[PDB]
């Protein structure tokens, strides 16, 4: 059941901010182990004396990465003067975040019809204000509200390329890589308490509850009208066997924050190829392989979607699969992006839901709970 | 004249420490960008609770990345209880120097004969004290003074790899990436006043200032015994036509900190055109290539030394070239390798001076100066 409850007109993903201590190492990282393009950027060579900031992107998949500039170079600024191409953007408040929580997403932002009226009818809901709105080059409008911990909902509407102050990069400089990654699917929290937070969020929104269907975790899912934005939170479960990871996050982080975040492939076999083969030259490592009972078992549940070639194709890349009542779903997962246990990104691909493809085909993969712990204990056995 | 002054037992350059804020992402691209192996870890998984550090090797090239992690992990810690293996490493002040500097390095790092030793003729010299000296499993004494700025020069010494604590990379992540790098040639200091700054270091070391043979800087170099630890320092020239660089890198740097590191490579064609072919995938630029007149000019000067084809393929890499009355040498220079307009990385390799070759043969380049004025003039003319 979608009540289609949004209090204001949500459009899709729009991009994700990563702060970061340096965005170029942690940009070209990311680039090379994603296949993401430069393509835009506002730093000291475009005039911003504040920040340097570096836009990624593959297909409608936007990663920027933001770090601060010694607070000397613009000392002599006020807001009404700034160069920050972010009006958002503030050196302590970066250098806090960073700080406490290592590498991480400080920004989901999503497209609006208008963000000024997103803003004001979210806080007038209950949404706690980050940043006002802010008109920039009479071209753009972006504002900002507190979503958990120290990560924000940012709000984006145009008038009619990333943002006003942000230069096209160079095609000299921009490599045009690209294993397959096309937009940003959902994007997961973990917090203390889920109820809570699923009120707070659900409250100035309006997002629905997303259908769906003992290891870890309570979980529910926040989605728009059309269920293309989609937001996941979690909560620990506490005494259990095997410490929650949910739990280990919260620690390392210092608090809640963001989990992870699900990147759809248009192909994820060749997107899991191509990150695989650049895991130990600079790229990003996986989960390790569930064993071969799983895909032994994957025959019995998946046999009518994928041919034996392609389930022995999952075999090779340790891909996952789970089915829905509408639709199936292959998905894997990195080890965590920086230094702490916190942050990772899953590899997605969706098949069904055909009408275009409705949101969330499929489900998120808990079934993959019960199956690999199953696939675990089967194997054992041999 | 090299009165081979030295106050303790100095060997070699043992390895440079960067304090990032995120090391994984940091070493991920250094790895990739100069073709050096992941070697040793200590982190989470090796039970250091304080920071993670990550260890990169090419020949004898030692890179240590290394990044807090949140202070609540090891709260219950004491230094006699501690789990980090470096034992100079302090949470403040690694997060001050990174907020405070960017990415940059925080320890030169050389080997002696006695780390107690050194340390102790050293402030009895002297030297302002950092980290007292520390005996690591019976097996490593480590100590530290300071450099200049918040950079600080790190005594390592060995009873009889890289230390107690860290564990070696599994080959499984340890991909052996080589593009030929070797070693490290010599580390270079900024400062505001290059007086104070020789007057100290010598004073503490007994290094003899190394000989050399009006754009940006004044600059003089100290050796070791052997002149194989080579440690140049610059000032900045002020009130001059173009502002000099050394006057911007103290000023996006917050003072005097470490300038560049030059490696030494056994094949520079081959270390650049491996790195040239990943500037664009994740590496690191290289800067502006010089007009075809500073190539046309080689022939002159270096026409004994390198054939045509030799010196077109300096052309082809943008690759400079400067001779001694002892030595030649080849050099290139990275654009910064992070945000900051700081510290970048030269790669070099000399010819001549066989006995081994001697430190420091052929110079610093510092005719290319005067080269690259007369070339880029002469090209304006056509
Ligand atoms: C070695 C680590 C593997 C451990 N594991 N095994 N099976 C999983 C199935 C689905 C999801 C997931 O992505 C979501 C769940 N619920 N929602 C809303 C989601 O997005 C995750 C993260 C896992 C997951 O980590
Ligand atoms: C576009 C930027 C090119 C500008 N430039 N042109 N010619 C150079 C020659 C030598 C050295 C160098 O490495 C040292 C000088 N003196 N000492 C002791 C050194 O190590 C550098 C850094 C340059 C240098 O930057
Ligand atoms: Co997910
Ligand atoms: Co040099």
Partial sequence: ?????????????????????????????????????????????????????????????????????????????????????????????????????????????????????????????????????????????????????????????????????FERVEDASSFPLDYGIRRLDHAVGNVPELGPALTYVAGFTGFHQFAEFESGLNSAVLASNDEMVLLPINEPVHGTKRKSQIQTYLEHNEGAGLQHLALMSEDIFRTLREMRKRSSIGGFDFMPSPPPTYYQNLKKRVGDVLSDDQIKECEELGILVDRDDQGTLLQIFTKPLGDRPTIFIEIIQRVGCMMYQSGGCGGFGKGNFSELFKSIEEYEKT
Same sequence: chains 1, 2.
Avoid at 9 to 31: L, M, P, Q, Y
Avoid at 110 to 136: H, K, T, W, Y
Avoid at 138 to 154: C, H, M, P, Q, S
């Fill in 1 to 165: 059941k979608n009540p289609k409850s949004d209090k204001f007109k949500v459009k899709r993903f729009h991009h994700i901010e990563f702060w970061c201590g340096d965005a170029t190492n942690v940009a070209r990282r990311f680039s090379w182990g994603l296949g993401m393009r430069f393509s835009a950027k506002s730093d000291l060579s475009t005039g911003n004396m504040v920040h340097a900031s570096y836009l990624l992107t593959s297909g409608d998949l936007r990663f920027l990465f933001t770090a601060p500039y010694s607070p000397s170079l613009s000392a002599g600024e006020i807001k009404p003067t700034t160069t920050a191409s972010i009006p958002s953007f503030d050196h302590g408040s970066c250098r806090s975040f960073f700080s406490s929580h290592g590498l991480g997403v400080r920004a989901v932002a999503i497209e609006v019809e208008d963000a000024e009226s997103a803003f004001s009818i979210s806080v007038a809901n209950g949404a706690i204000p980050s940043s006002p709105p802010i008109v920039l080059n009479e071209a753009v409008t972006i504002a900002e509200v507190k979503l958990y911990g120290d990560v924000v909902l940012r709000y984006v509407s145009y008038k009619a390329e990333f943002l006003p102050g």
